[PDB]
Each structure stands twice: as C-alpha cells, then as structure tokens.
Design an enzyme around this catalytic site. Sequence first.
Site, PDB file in Angstrom:
ATOM      1  N   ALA A  38      -7.099  -2.708   6.806  1.00 55.17           N
ATOM      2  CA  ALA A  38      -8.332  -2.333   6.012  1.00 55.17           C
ATOM      3  C   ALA A  38      -9.410  -1.786   6.984  1.00 55.17           C
ATOM      4  O   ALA A  38      -9.897  -0.682   6.870  1.00 55.17           O
ATOM      5  CB  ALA A  38      -8.805  -3.451   5.227  1.00 55.17           C
ATOM      6  N   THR A  83       0.790  -1.216  -0.017  1.00 57.35           N
ATOM      7  CA  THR A  83       0.000  -0.100  -0.036  1.00 57.35           C
ATOM      8  C   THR A  83       0.912   1.273   0.067  1.00 57.35           C
ATOM      9  O   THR A  83       2.033   1.458   0.663  1.00 57.35           O
ATOM     10  CB  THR A  83      -0.895   0.121   1.392  1.00 57.35           C
ATOM     11  OG1 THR A  83      -1.737  -1.109   1.228  1.00 57.35           O
ATOM     12  CG2 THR A  83      -1.820   1.193   1.076  1.00 57.35           C
TER      13      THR A  83
END
EC number: 3.4.25.1
Lengths: 198, 222, 231, 227, 250, 232, 212
Positions: free
Chosen positions: G49, G1
Amino acid sequence: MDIILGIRVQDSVILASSKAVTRGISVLKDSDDKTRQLSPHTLMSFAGEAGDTVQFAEYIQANIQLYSIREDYELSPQAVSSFVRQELAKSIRSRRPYQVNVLIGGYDKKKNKPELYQIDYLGTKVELPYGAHGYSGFYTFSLLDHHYRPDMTTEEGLDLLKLCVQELEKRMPMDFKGVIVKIVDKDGIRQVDDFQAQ
Amino acid sequence: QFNPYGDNGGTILGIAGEDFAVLAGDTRNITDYSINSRYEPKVFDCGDNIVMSANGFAADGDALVKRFKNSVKWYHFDHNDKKLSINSAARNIQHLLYGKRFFPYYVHTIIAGLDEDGKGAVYSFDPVGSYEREQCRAGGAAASLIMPFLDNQVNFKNQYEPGTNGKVKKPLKYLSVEEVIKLVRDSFTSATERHIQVGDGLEILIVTKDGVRKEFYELKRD
Amino acid sequence: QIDYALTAVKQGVTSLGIKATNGVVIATEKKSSSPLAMSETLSKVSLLTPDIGAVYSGMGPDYRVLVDKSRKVAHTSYKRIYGEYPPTKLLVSEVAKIMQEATQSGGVRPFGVSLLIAGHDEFNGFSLYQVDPSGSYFPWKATAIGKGSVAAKTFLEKRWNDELELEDAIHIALLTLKESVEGEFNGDTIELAIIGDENPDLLGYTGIPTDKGPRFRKLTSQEINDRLEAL
Amino acid sequence: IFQVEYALEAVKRGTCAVGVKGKNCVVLGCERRSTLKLQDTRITPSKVSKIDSHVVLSFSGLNADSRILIEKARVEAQSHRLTLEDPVTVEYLTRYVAGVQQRYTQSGGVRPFGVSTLIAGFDPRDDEPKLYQTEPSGIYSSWSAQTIGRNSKTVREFLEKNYDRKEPPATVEECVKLTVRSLLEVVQTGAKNIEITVVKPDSDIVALSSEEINQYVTQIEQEKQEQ
Amino acid sequence: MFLTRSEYDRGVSTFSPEGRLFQVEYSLEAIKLGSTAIGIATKEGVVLGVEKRATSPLLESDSIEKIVEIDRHIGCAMSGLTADARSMIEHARTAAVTHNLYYDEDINVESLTQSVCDLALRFGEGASGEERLMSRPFGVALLIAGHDADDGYQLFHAEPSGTFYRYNAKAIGSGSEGAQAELLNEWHSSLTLKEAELLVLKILKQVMEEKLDENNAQLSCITKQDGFKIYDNEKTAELIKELKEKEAAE
Amino acid sequence: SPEGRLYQVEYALESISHAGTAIGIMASDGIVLAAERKVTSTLLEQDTSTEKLYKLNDKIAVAVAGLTADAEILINTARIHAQNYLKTYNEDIPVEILVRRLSDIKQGYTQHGGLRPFGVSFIYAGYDDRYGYQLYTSNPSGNYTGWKAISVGANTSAAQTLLQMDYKDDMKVDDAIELALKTLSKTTDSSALTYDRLEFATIRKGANDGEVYQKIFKPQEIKDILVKTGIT
Amino acid sequence: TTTLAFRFQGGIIVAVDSRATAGNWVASQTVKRVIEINPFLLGTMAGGAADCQFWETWLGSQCRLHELREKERISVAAASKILSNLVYQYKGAGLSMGTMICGYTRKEGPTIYYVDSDGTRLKGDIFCVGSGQTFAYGVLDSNYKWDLSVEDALYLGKRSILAAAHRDAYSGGSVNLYHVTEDGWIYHGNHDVGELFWKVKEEEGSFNNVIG
C-alpha cells in the site's frame, strides 16, 4: 529459467533466446528480446534473476559503448568477454551479488573469426563451439555433440539450431513461447524473424 | 530474544461530518491480560484544529504524536504562524511514518479536522504511511465489531426502501453531530461486551469551525 | 628549500662509504656533545636489515626517526609479503620515497640528512647508495658527505681501484676519517660497520642450514683500536 | 577574484574553431600547423571529438585541457542513457559541459578551463539542428553559426555578413561549401591546415578526410578568380 | 582629481572599525552594474521585465535566459552573472518541489525566498558552530515574484548578502538608481496588469536610452489563474506597439 | 596567468631544457630510444641506475628528460595502469591509451593548482597491433604528439634540425640506430661521446619471428655499436 | 487486489478495484488504487500500500523537477526508469510494489511500462496485476481489438475488473476508471461493484449461474 542458447560456426555466431517473461503464475509477455547489443559486432544474451538480469546487461552496454566512443575502436570480443567476467567476479563477493548468466557472441574483425563465450553469475568464463545456461544444456548438448562440425555454413547451423529448440519443446516442461534468433557476422548483428516455421 | 514491540489494544474510530468531525477512542490501556490504566487518553488535540490518534503500541504512538505536535510548532516558526491544512498534515505524517519504513511506528493512526473548504475530514494511515481520506474508519482491535455496524447505520448499506421490492436503496441522509455521537457510543458499548480489550472509558474530540470540544462517557470495566 | 636542507647536511659530522669486491664499509665519527655523555648510548651507524646498514651526516634526530620509519617499511612493504628481506636497491627506493614525500608535502620540511645505505642482496650482490633530502638517490663505488666531504671524496678517487678486498677498504676509510676528525681519534669516537661474509656466530640459534646469519657487523670499540695501531 | 578573464585569453591563442547550422545538417571545423615536418600524421587527427553517436564537439584552447572535458562529457552521455534510457539532448550535454567549467571557479578555489567549445548535433528523433558554444565562465549560447579561437573575430565578422536566417544552406554539400571559405581567411597554408566533421539527422556522423577537403578548396578558388 | 582610501578596504570577512563588512558591501554594488531588471506588483498579477541586449543576428536570442520559472506560481528575474546563479536556482526549484511533496501544497513566496537567502548565507572558508560549505558570496541579485493564497501577489529582492526586502515594485541593474526613483513616482495601490505590463516598458525605454523591441526586451508575468508565463516575442511586441501609441497621446 | 600563459609550467618546461638529452627515431620495422647521462663523477657506479631509460611493459618503454625522483613517481603508476588493463581485458595495453593516461595526470596539476607540476618530459616507444610501431611525447603541459623522430632536453632545438635532415621514411632499424648516435655528435656538451655517458633501447620485429622483442642495452653492447663509428 | 492497464487506438485505459484486506477482514473499500502522479501520468497501486503511494508521489516530484530543468515533458520511458532505478536500489530490503506506469507523449505514443519490487521494467500492451490478475487477463485476452471505440474499450476495463472482483475474495468494492489521451488523463468515475454486478447480469445475459 529461461532459455539461453548459442552456437559458433564457420562465419558467424548464433544466439537463441526464449521469448517469454513469467511472473510466478501468469505469463506477462510473449515477445522478449533477451539481448543487448554491446557494439556493432558483439551481442550478449542473458537470463537469470528478475531485475538483476537487465540492469547488468545495460551497465555493460553503457561501459562498452563508452570505450567504443572514446578510442573510436571496436573493442574485440575476447576483451568484452574478459571484462564482463571481471564485473561478475567482482559482484560475487559483494553485498548483493548480480545473479546473471550470459552468452557473449561476436565477430573479431581483426582475426576475421567468430567467437562464442559462456559466463555464469559466478564469473566462470570459457570459450565454446556451442553453449547454454540454465537447464537448456541437457536436452540439446547431446544433439550438438553429434551433429556439429566447425566448418558449418551459417545456413547449416541455423538448421541444427531449430532441431534443438524442437527437442526443448518436446521434453521440457516450461512453455517458453518460442525463441528469437540473432546472428553476428562480418556485417554485424541481424535478427531472423522467420524462425518458428522456417 | 528481545522484542521491541507490544500491544496495548484500545480501539479508535474517526467519522467525517458535513460541517464537523469526531475522533473517538477508548481509555483502556493494557498489556496482555492485565490492565495498565483505566484512564490514559488515546486521542489528542494538536492545535490548528487537528485531532489525532496513533493506536496499537503506545510507546510508538505516543512518540509519533510528540513528533507531529512538534512538526506543527515548526511549520509555524518556518512559515509565519500559517494554519496547517488538514490535507497537508496528512502528507507530512506519511513522510513521518515512512521515515521509519524499515522499523515502523507500529500504529494504525487516524487524524480528523476540517478541510480547506470547511467540510469535515478524516484520514487513516498504515504504520508505513499509506494514507487515504475516509468517511469513517475504525482502527484497533475491535475495528471488526464496529465497521459492519457503521456501514449499516451510517451509510445505510444493505438497506432498501420498504415495499419497493428491492430496487430503491434507502436514501443517504446527513447526520447531526448529536446523532453521530449516538452511533459512536453504541458502537463502543457493543464492542465492550464482546471484546476484552475494550472498556473503561470513551473519549471523543469534536472539531467544528468553532474549535475542539471534549465529551467523555463511561464504559463497562470488566 | 630542499636546497637549504642539503645545506644542513653540508655541515655536521663527516661520514663515508666504500664498496669492495667482497664487502662494503661505512663510517662516521661520534662527536661527543660533552665528555660527561657516554657516547656508546647513541649509534650513528644503524642496522636496517641483517644484510643492510646506514650512516648519515647532519641532523641527529631526523636520522633516528628515519632509521625507525625505515626498519618498519622493510617489513610492512616487503618481508610480510614475500618472506624475504628487501634488496638494497629497493629498500633504498622506499626510503627516498619517504623523504621525497616530506618534500612535496605541505606543512612539513624535508629531512636534514643525507644517508649512506650499504648492503648485500642475493641477486644484485654488493652495492652502496646515497640518499639526499631531495629524495633523489645515487649508486656509489665510494663517496663522502658532510664537512670533510670534499677532502675525502678526492682522497677516495685517488685510492680506489675495483680490486679492493674489504680489509683494504676498511684501511682506507680509517685514513680518510683520520684527516677530517674533529675530536679525538680512537674506538670510542669512531663508528664503523661492514657488510661482509655471513656471520653465523651472531644468529642466536642453530638448526636450519638454509639461513646463515647477518652480513652486517658493527666493529667493537676494541676491533677499531687494534687496526689503528697497525695503521 | 578575476582569474576567469585570463583563461578566456588562452582561448584566443588556440587552434581556431568554427561551426555552421543548416536547413537539416550541421558542421564544425578547426585545427593547427600542418606538420612540423617530422611528426606522426596518422595518430592525433582528433580535431572534432565524438561524444555520443549523434553529438560532436570542437574547442579552441589548450589541447591538454580539452581532454578532461571531452571525457567527463562522453561519460555523462552514457550515464544519462543508463539512468534514464534516452540519449542526452544537445542542450543538456551542453548545459552539463558549461555547468562544469562554472564549478571550476566558485568552489574550493581552483583554476578554470582554457577552452571554449562548440557542440553540435541533432536531438534524438527530432530532426532540428542544434549548435551551442561554451566558455570558461559557465555561459552557454545557441548560435545559427559561430567561431571562437585565434583570429576568431575575423571569422565571426565574415559569417555575420554571409549567413542569413531567411535562407539557411539547405544542401548537405553547400553547407560545407561555406564553412571552408570561412577558415581560409585565418589559416596559414590552406587545406593542409584545418579539417572538418559533419553530422546529419539520427546518429549519422561522417567526418571528412583530406581528399574530400581538396575537391572543395580547389573548386572554390576556381570560381574565385573569375572576375 | 584625488584619491580617498581607507586601510580596511579589501578585508575578507573581517570587521572594519565601524562594523562594516566591505567584502559584502561591494558584493552589493555589482548588482548596480549588470543587466537591467524590473518588477512591479498589481492586485491582478506581477510583471518582470529585463534587458536582453542581443549582440548579433546569429546568436538566436532565447539562450539569453534572464527570466526563469521556479514553480508554476513563482518566477524570478536576474541581473548580473547569469552563469553564477545556475546553482542558486537549482536550489529554489528543488526547495519548492520538495515542499510540495512533504506538504501537498504550493510553497509560500515569502518562504521560498528566505530559503534562497539561507543558501547564499553559507559564505566562507572557516566556520565553527555550524558549517557553511561554499566559497564566496553569491554574485547575483534576484527579483522573485509569485502568488500564494495567504499574502496575495508579491515581489521580493534577494541579495547576495542573504537578506531581503519585499518591494511593491523594484528595479535592479545598470539603471536601477534612476528607474527606481521613477517607479517610486508612478506606482499606485490600484494598478491593473495591463497598466503595469506597459510601465515596465516605459521604464526600460528610459534607462536604456534607446528604442526597444523583442531582440532586447523579454516580458513575463504571474497570474493566479494562468500561472507564470514568459511572453513570446509576438506578445511583447504589440505590447510595445501599444506604448508607441499611448505615449503619442500628448 | 596574465596573457593566456601557463607560468608554473614554462618554469619546469625550461627546467627540462637544462637536464638530460633524449632521442626517439621510428623506423619502418622498429623503434629506437637513447639518452645522455647527467654530470658524472669518476666514482659514480655506471652500471645499475638505468636512470633515464625505464621499461613500462614488455611492449612499451620511455626515455626521460627531467628530475629522476619525479619521473619514478609517474612511471610507478603507469606500470600499474598497464597491468590493470591486462587483468581487466586480458589484452596488452594500447600505447596511446597509456600515454593519455599519464598526460592526464600531468595536466592534473596544470589545473588543480594546489600542488606543483611535473619535471620530466617523455619519449614513449611502443608497439600494439592496432597502430604499428608508435612514438610519442609528453611535456608537463599535458599534451602528447605523434613523431617519426623527436628529442627533449638541453640542445633540443639543435638536434631536431639534424634529424629533419638525415631521416628517410624507408629507414630500417639499424639505419636509425646510427642516425640516433650520429646526431648526438652535435648535441653533446661533452667533447667526445663514450659508452658510459649512454643508455640505449630497441623495440624490433623480434630476434626471430613475426613478433616483438624489447632490449635495454647493457654497457658492453653499447661500446659495440659505438664501434660502428662514434668511438673505436 | 486487481489492477489492469492497456494500449489502444485512443490511448490507454486503466482500471482498478478498491478493496483492501487484513486477512479475512475487509478494512476499507475506499482505496485509490490508481495514483494521479501528475496530470499526464498514472500509476497503479498493487503490492505494498505505502510503498506505491509513496515512491510514485515522489516520482511526481522528480518529474516536475525534470520538466523545469529541461523546459520539456518527461517521457514515459524515462519517468518509469527513474522509479525502476530508485526501487532496484532498495532490492530485497523488503519493498513490495507491482505497478503499471502509463503515459501518452508526443514522441512515444500511448506507452505502458510494468515496474516491480524485483527491479523489472517491461514495456507492453496489456498488463494486469494483483490477486485477481488471472481473471482480468481472461476477459481482456478474449475481447480485445486494438481499434476499440474509446467508449467500448472503457467498458472493457470496467468489466475485466468485474470478472475478478466476483471470484477473488481479495478484490472487489468499486471500480475506478481512467482514460489517458495525449492531452492528459480523464477520470471516468467510481462505479460500485455491488450495483454494477446486477446491471451487467441483465444487459449481458451473463453470470448465468448466479441466482438473482
């Protein structure tokens, strides 16, 4: 860690504090004031665990700004010290222990003397001419032993401080990205922002 | 020691249409290397035109379906028989899942229906309740054998207009519920061949503005 | 309401206490609620620590549950921390605190008893205390409580000097009790205890010379009759 | 359930308290009987109470009752800096104080406070003066100026006819000039009777002493007699 | 003159021989004895007005908050102990955001209202079954007005007793018995927001037996488009000026 | 509480003007405490109680006028606050802070009106290096006040007058020891004042240096200073 | 990410990737790594997440609750310290989040706080976070003036994300762009990294060792 220094002279106390904040792989900030003002004439530098560090120093800030405001009296350094200690000693047998090391330095307006206190995350407290947490002590304590007089002018002591930082930049593997030096005396807490080239 | 968790495999796939949505799963329920049932359905009608599937560990998914089907009964009683916005059930599921954040429902979980605009919608979930709205996502064991193929034959990825050198991407079309059904039952007949946890039966729930329909297709039993 | 409890104390059998130079003495009468009852099965003079005893005037039961609660508080709040037993002054404090709480607490009436607690601690010497239902407590050279309270308290001023040997104070507290007595007057209807010399006879063991045994001795049915003849 | 109004009575009887907004400054004022000859002068001159570095508070009422407020507030003042890192806003400190006198009626069934309070100071950064007033009920109101206490009505009447919004006392000096006159009406000796505190933008709270208070009274009653 | 008295007056949470709970029958008369408050519903918005009643030039009106926001689509007006409703509002604002979080949608005005009633429905000092933790009926009435997409624009009267009605236009407070019989006369299913902005003033003029300005009236409304705004003193004035004229018609 | 009145308080505030009589005088270099003892019987043990003069810490002490069993409940918790402020800040507790700590518990009942107020009124005499020697007062009202000289209990209104008269700011400590006894000339229902109706205390500039000795008088030491005039 | 945010003359730029992986497998590239908290504040998903989506969604609530109660907008300083405090409360219960809270207020100016699972709260000018954090820092550090045309500085975010998507296996997909002004935030599209790479190799002359 994470550089926490401090030396008490004749007319004041001086605290050095590395400017760097590192999150594993990257250096996130090159300018971190690692110290909260606990009151006009009392300063606390600190290093240690990630979040545990700030959250503690601010809790103490609050609780001392509250005793200041309530009795309209500036709590003496010895006392701010022996309170911060108890607050750490309390948390050591607690569920998640504050993992924080601190240096408290301030001017006792009633004895007109400077005082420097060293307290580790365990609640271990002792008063010193000079002090440090982490490994900072190993490179620098040999120099202080040698060059320290307790009658040192505030200027004489800033000189001796630069000499320690220099040794730490030479024989220490961490890039701590400088220090911020703060001074505590009769007139309060001021910060020397001309240091890595004085 | 006691392990409070399992795998029962199976594999689900949810696809958002333009005026519709399909939510498909296999019918095979297993433990390790044995077969438990060839028919034990994975995809459920929850009312208010919402179909969902909590796949992975059956007991945890079965229990989460129960708990949501019930969250509906009470959003009725509590708000005068109001219809549960697809987008609102998704958020309620996030709070359901994250409720058990530190002992999660071990399920990749997908719902499908229609958004307040009539267009098709599909939502996917973590076991801890990260949710995003998706065009088509597969979850489960054979997730990896389906998505690449779907990316190619549904979103026409890596496909170009012939003899344009490679400058014009093949134009995205939109597909009849009958075409999506083609791709679904070929995604599955494929996976069944190369995954030992997939087979037996294929059940699809289909949501239109007209309601929920069940089509069912056989799968290889090996 | 505390005032009404002091009233149950004002009636109910007379009891007294006299401090001396080398001991303390406390006594009351054992009024038999019947001749069928065996009066040896009930003790109005109870041991709290082997250096401390107590007597009362008033409501029987309230005294029992107070003697019990009191023994326990001597361990829970002192012996289990400092290894010693408590000093008269402080054990008395811890009882007043107990009674003072029945006062200031809701849903409960104060106790119907005044207590006379007598004892010896190594540093404060001898001492005799009174504890009232109010939770107040006062130190006495000598006093009495109950019906015969006024007659006896007046006789004690008349007969008390600060040079009494314990045997002199036993003698007095028998006369004092002879004028008030309701029933008969012998060793079966008198209860008398003293706080005097250490009684090694009564320790139960021998081998550590540092602990020497109970100062509290409860005189036997015989010892009393013996004193009443040469009386 | 009426006990509220009774407490509001004790307000009346207590040390008289006032306050006055300015073009950019704020002032309080209040107190009682000089000294009963033999009392210690230097150890309870705590008329107006500091809450944070920028917020103050006076009260009319039971002196022994205020303290329980001047704390619960001095505390939420820090417990706001601590959990939100942002000094309390004068409206919020006020709404919290009033909101507490309020919860001292409607639950458990316990007695309400014998204090009305005035609360002054500047929000953080913003330099617009703020003045508020609380009362045993739970009501907070903002005032261009106000008084509550004993013979407080004489003063509220005085002030109404002496303050105007069109031109607020701009000068630091003159803003006090006015607050004095307004207590001289109700006192019982003069300067030796009631004292004052003064807060200016950005945590600059400087309470006034005895000697600055008589370079005022004896510079008022000069212009006075001149007819 | 003369004195009528029953033996079951007073009685706290105990039934009269009729089934009346006089403690709460009285809780309900004290709405009739506070500030005036008026709500009217159009198909183009909902209007809430109140009586300010400033008692000085010093006291800068606007610390007189008798109308407050709940979410951007729900407002309420109050008559009575404004101080006693601090907690009643906190619970409504908290319930409306809590719903928005758990469900990703604005909360139905009907259910936001019922939730506030379910709060004042915890009146008592001794309950077995389920506990109702508090002390006295909630001493304030509410006009709750807002917009959801199921049931258009809405107006509600929340009483301290825990129940409610959905009036198409309601008045509570000092003037209510009279203001109400006037709304009952002048309201139609086809009002425009402009028209009701004004009818709320006309009825405040009446049952205040006085001439009105922005120092004694506060107006607010709630539209689908702009949300729930409270008219600042300027707008409330040329709305007033606009009536001084409209009534000089005949 | 009808007119703005604290009823259950005045009840006990005037129950005070019955029991006891206590005095405090602050000299320039010391402080003085004193009390008369309740209606005594011949047989009550004089020396033991120290029934109305209690030590709080090595630098603070209180005189009591009120119900004994009631003040002990307070004092027990104040001797503790002292020690908690030690174990915590390693400095001796400042007098005002201790006084406020109590006054706040007194006012605790003056409001949580579900339990009964406090008998008892205190004179506190203490030294802390922030505000020289100090003299304080504590009615169950909740209020405390500063005093150069003060009195509580029966015949209060009377002594306050003689005190106002013979007091001078330059006063020494021995000068104030007299002023205290002298003016329990009047305020004594017992014709003639004895050493046994008394209890005394001092906080002086030490028996030696620049520091602070504390001294609760033993009976004999009283009959010795009583010797200076009182009785001989 | 890969997530990054920075201050400048014209406010704040926020840029993120959208790739999300379960090991070697890429499960979605349709991830909203920037969290529209409320229309005046943004957070960046990085770490866990759910842990991010959730507590920042919750933050959005506690933020509205705060604006209703004080009739005034909440300051980035306090918005962030609410999240920092809620998260320090759950220390080492296994929360995972590393996020930049971004806002532009009357009183504070453009303001960025970095807040993580550990309990850390840091005010800064430039923060990148995630697997490809080091790559972004490289591009940002060399080409960052303060007075950057709002259009040039929006391109800088577009590209510091590109550098990272390229190298990092665990970053990639598409880039989301946001601009934060005092008046609120403005989306600036979703530009697919596939097509964007090629567009940049031509116009910049860069990525010279990528045969295409």
